[PDB]
Amino acid sequence: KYIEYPVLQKILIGLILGAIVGLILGHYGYAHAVHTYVKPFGDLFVRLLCMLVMPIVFASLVVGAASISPARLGRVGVKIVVYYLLTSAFAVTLGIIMARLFNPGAGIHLAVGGQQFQPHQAPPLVHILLDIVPTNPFGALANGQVLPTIFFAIILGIAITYLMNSENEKVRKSAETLLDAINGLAEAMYKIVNGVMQYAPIGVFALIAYVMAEQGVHVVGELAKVTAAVYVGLTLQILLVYFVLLKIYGIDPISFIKHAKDAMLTAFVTRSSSGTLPVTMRVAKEMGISEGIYSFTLPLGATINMDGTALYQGVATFFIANALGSHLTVGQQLTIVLTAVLASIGTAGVPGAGAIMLCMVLHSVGLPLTDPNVAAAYAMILGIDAILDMGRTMVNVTGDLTGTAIVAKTE
Amino acid sequence: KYIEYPVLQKILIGLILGAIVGLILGHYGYAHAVHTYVKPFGDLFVRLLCMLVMPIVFASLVVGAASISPARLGRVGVKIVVYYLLTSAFAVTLGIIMARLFNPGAGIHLAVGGQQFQPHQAPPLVHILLDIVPTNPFGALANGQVLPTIFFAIILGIAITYLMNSENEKVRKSAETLLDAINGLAEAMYKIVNGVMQYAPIGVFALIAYVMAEQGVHVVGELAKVTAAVYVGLTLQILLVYFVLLKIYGIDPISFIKHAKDAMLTAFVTRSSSGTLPVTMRVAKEMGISEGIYSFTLPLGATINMDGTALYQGVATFFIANALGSHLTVGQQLTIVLTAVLASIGTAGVPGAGAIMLCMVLHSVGLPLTDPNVAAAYAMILGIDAILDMGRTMVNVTGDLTGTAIVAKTE
Amino acid sequence: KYIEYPVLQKILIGLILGAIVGLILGHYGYAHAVHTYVKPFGDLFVRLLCMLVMPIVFASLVVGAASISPARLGRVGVKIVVYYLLTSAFAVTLGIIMARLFNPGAGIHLAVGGQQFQPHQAPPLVHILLDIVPTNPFGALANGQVLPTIFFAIILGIAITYLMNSENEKVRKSAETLLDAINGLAEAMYKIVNGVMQYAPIGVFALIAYVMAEQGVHVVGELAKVTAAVYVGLTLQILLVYFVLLKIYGIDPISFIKHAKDAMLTAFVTRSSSGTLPVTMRVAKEMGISEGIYSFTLPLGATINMDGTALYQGVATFFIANALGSHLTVGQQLTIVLTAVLASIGTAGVPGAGAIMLCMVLHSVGLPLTDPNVAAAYAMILGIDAILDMGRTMVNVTGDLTGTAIVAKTE
C-alpha cells in the first residue's frame, strides 16, 4: 500500500479531486458511467459507517450514562455536568436557527429513482411515547429501532453505577466487569472508525464524484451554503454562548482564547477532540486552573459535551430534510434537539465521530438511510464532513475549557 | 419530587385509592374517560416490566444454572439443591390444586375489543420438543421466544462451570469474567426493577383504577377470590410440606417457627427475600445451625428456591387462563409446573421479582401479553401483586431455613 | 445412565449398528415407520449442532482474528502464520480436486418431499460484495446471515488487538476483558459440543438408520465413495504438501514421521487436536525443536491451521451439492476455498469441530440446512463424520509440526 499521508489533507485531495473528475464528467461521458463504477465505492464507505451506528449508539450510551449517573459524581461535577448539557442543548437550538435563516438543501430537492419522499404517519401520540420503552431490548436492538435502544442504554448505564455502591463486593465487582466489557466494545468500535477513515479518501472521492456527475453544479452552492450555516453557527456559539458566559464569571474572554490558542488549533487540525486532551490540559494550568478541577472536567468533556457536534447534527438534519422536500414538523423538530444532544454524547471525539452519530438522529425523526433519497442526501454531507469536522472538533474542546474555567470560579 | 414513603404502604395507597376512584367512576363519568387518560400510565408501568423479562430470563438463568452445576457444589449442597427443586416443584403442584378448587377468573371472562381469545394449535409433538433447542440463540433471544432461550441459558451456565475446572488458567480465567459479566447484567436489571417499583404506586393506581371503571365490582370478588387461593395455598405449603418434613427429621416445628419469627416477619414486610438474608442468618445460629451450613445454604436459597413464588406463578397462570375463558390442556398445564420452577429460579427475590418472571411462564404455555385479553388479565394480578408478594416472600425465606435445618440433621 | 464407553467406539457402534437396523428395515417394515420414530432423534442431534453454529462462528473468529492481528505476533510468527493459511488455503484447493475426480453424491440425488432444489439468483455482483459488510452487526448476527458476521468478527478481533497497544491502561485493560469474555463464550460453546457429542452415539444411530431405510443401499456406495475422496486427499496433502515442503528445507521426511509417530496416532484416536497438544510438544523437542519455537507455534496451530478440516469442508460441500443435483458455479466454488479457510480457523479442534463449521461454509454458497434436501444430505455426512474426523484431526496436528520444523530452519 504505502498510503501514509496525513488523512486530513489525504482526504481533502479526494474531495477537491473528486469534484473536478465529477464535473468534467458533468458534460461529456454522462455520469451514468459514474453511477455504475464510481458510486459503488462511495457506498462501501457509506455502509462501513452505518455498520457501526448500532453497536456504538449502545455501548456509547451505556458508558456515557455511567459517566453522569446521579449520583456518582462529586458535586464538583454536578456543576460541570449541568454545564455540558445546557451548552449542547443550546448548541443544537442554535443550529436549528441557522437551518432556518439558511435553507441548505431547499432547492437541492431530489427524487432519486423518479419518486419522491414521504414519511409514515406517526402513531397516536400515546404510542409514540410508550414505544420509546423497548419491549425486548435484544429485539429492539437486534433490528435498528434507535430510541428504544437509547432508552435502554441510559437505564442500563445509570443502573450499573448503583451496583458499584452496593455493599456486597461480588455485586460491586460484577458491575465493574460488565461495564468494563461494554466499554471496550465501544472503545473498539472507534478503532474501526479510525480504520474506516483510512478509506475515507477513496470513499469521499466516490461520493462527491457522483454528486457532481448528477445534480450538476447546483450542489456546490448548497454544499457551501451549508458550511456557511455551520460556521456562522459555530462562531455564534462561542461569541453568544462562551464569551457571554465568561464575562458573566469575571473571566477575560479575549486573553482567554489567547491561552486556548494552542488547544484549539491542535484540535482543529487533528480533528481528534480526544487526541487533543493533553494539549487541552497543558493549557489547563497555564491559565491557573486548579489540578483537581481540569483533571476531572477536561477528561469528561473529551467524550461528553460535544456542543460543536450538536450544532452539526442540528443543521445536518435540516439539510437532508430540505433536500428531500420534507418540512420538519415542530415536534420531530424538537426531537432533533433532544436527540442531537444524546447523539453528541454518543460521538467518539474522533475523525468519523460526528457523521456516524447523525444516523442516530435521522432514524429518529423518520428518515431511514435505507431510503434512496435520504441515503442520497446523507451521501452529500458525508462527503464534505472533513471540512465541517474541523471547525466542529474545535468548538468541542473550547466548550470544555470554557466550562472548566467557570466551574473553578465557583468552586 | 420528595416521594420518600415506604413503597410498601406507598403502593397500598395507590391500590386502595385507585379502587375507589375507579368505582365512583363506575357510575357517573363512564370509565371510557379512564381508558383514555388513566390507563396509559397503567400501561407504561406494565411495559417497563415486560422490558426486563428477556435480559433477566437470560442472565438470570445463566447464573442460576452455574449455581447448581453438577458437579460444582460440595455434596453438602447436592443435598440442599435436591431440596429446593422438590420443594418448589411441589409448591407449584400445590398451586394448581388451589387453582382447581378455586376458579379465580372463571366468570371474570373478558373479550376486550369484543373478540375472544383462542390459542394457536401446537405443532406436532415432535416439533414442540425439537423447538426447545434454539437454532440461533441470538435470534431466539433477539425476538421473544422463551423456552429456546431458557434452554440455551442453562446450557451456557452449566458449561461455564466446567471451564472453571479447566487445568488451563486462561480458560479458567475467561470463564470467570464472562460469567461475571452476565451476572451483573442480571444483577443490574434488578436495580431497574427496584427503580420501576418506585413507579409502582402510580402504575398500580392506574391499573386497578381502570379495572374498576370496567368489569364493575365483580372483579373485587375475583381478585380477592384469587388471593384466597394463594394464601390458603401458602399456609398449606408450610403446614403440609414444611412441618411434615420437619417432624420427619426430629425437628420441633412449633418452636422452630418461634425462632424464624424474626426472619419471617422481616421478609414479609420488606418483601426482599434477598435484603432479608442477614436476619435469616442471625436466626441461622440462634437455633444452633452449623456455620459452614447456613453460610452456604441461606445465601443460595436467597435467589434460588423461591417455592413461595412457584405457588404464585402456578395460581397466577390459572387466573389468566380462566379470565380469558380458555381451559389449560394438561400438558401445557404440566408445562407450567416445569416452567414455574425455572421461572421461580429466575425471580430476583425483590419487590418486582415474582410478577416479572410470570411473563416467562405465560409466553410458554401460549399466552403472549402482546394480546389485548391476556394483557388485560395480567394487568389485574399485576395490580394486586404487592399483596400477594408479601406472603409470597415470606414462604421463600421459610423454605430456606426449613432446608438448612434438615440438611444439618443429616450432615 | 452408566454410559461411560470411549465415545469413539461408543459412536462407531451406533453407526455400524444403525446401518444394519436400517437395511433390515430396507425391506420388511417400510422405513416410513423409521421416518416417524427413528429420524426424530437424528434431528434432535442435527439441531443441537446448528444451534452452536452462530455463537461459535462469532466468538470463534473474534478470537482467531486476535491471534493473528498484524501486527501482534513476533515476526517469528508472521512466518508461521503465512504458513498455516497457505497450507490450509491449498488444503481446500486440493479437496475440490478430489470432489472433481470423485463425484460423491452425484447419483445419490434426492428430492425429499418430491420437489427438487434450486438456489436463489445471486444479486448483482455489486450488492454481493457490499453485502459482506453488515449494516447492523446485531441484526446480521441475530438472524443467521454468516458472511456479514464473519466480516464483523475479524474486524472486531483485529481491532481489539490495537487497543492492547494503547498507551492508556484503562483502554488497554478494557480490551483485555471484553476479548476475554468473547473468548470463553466460544471456549464454553465447545463444552456444549463435547456434551452434544455424548449424544452423538444415539443421534448417529438415528441418522444413518434413516438414510438406510430410504436411499436403499446405494448410499453406502456414495458414503464410502466420499470417504475415499477425503483420505486419498488427506494422504495427498501430506505427500504433496508436507514431504514436498520438507525436502525443500533439508528436513528428512521419512525419519520425520517416525517422531511424529506418537503425536499423530494420538490425535488420530482422540480426535482432539487440542487435547493432543502435550503429545505434540513432547515430540517437539525429541526432534531438536527450539523451546521458544514450538512453545509458540504448536499452541497456535492447535486451534488455527486445521488444513485437515479445510480439505474436509472442501469435499463435504461437493457432496451436498452433487447429492441435490446442483452444480457449483465457479465463483461460489472459489467462495468455498475462501470460506473453508475461515471455517477451519473456526473449528475448535475437538470431536464435533469440523462438521459444525461446515454449516458456516454452506450458508455461504447458498445451501441453507433449513431446506429439506440440504438438511437431508448434510444428515448423511454428519452420520459418518466420526470416520472422517479421525484422519482429519491427524493431518491438523501434522501440519502444525510440519510448520514448526520449517520455521525453525529459517529462524
Ligand SMILES: N[C@@H](CC(=O)O)C(=O)O
Ligand atoms: N471528531 C470530532 C467530533 C465530531 O466530528 O463529531 C472531535 O474530535 O471531537
Ligand SMILES: N[C@@H](CC(=O)O)C(=O)O
Ligand atoms: N420479591 C419476593 C419474590 C417474589 O415476589 O416473587 C422476594 O423477596 O423473595
Ligand SMILES: N[C@@H](CC(=O)O)C(=O)O
Ligand atoms: N476435531 C478435529 C477437527 C475437526 O474435526 O474438524 C480436531 O481434533 O482437530
Ligand SMILES: [Hg+2]
Ligand atoms: Hg449511517
Ligand SMILES: [Hg+2]
Ligand atoms: Hg411482562
Ligand SMILES: [Hg+2]
Ligand atoms: Hg449445522
Ligand code: NA
Ligand atoms: Na459523545
Ligand code: NA
Ligand atoms: Na467536548
Ligand code: NA
Ligand atoms: Na430465582
Ligand code: NA
Ligand atoms: Na428462597
Ligand code: NA
Ligand atoms: Na479453527
Ligand code: NA
Ligand atoms: Na492445527
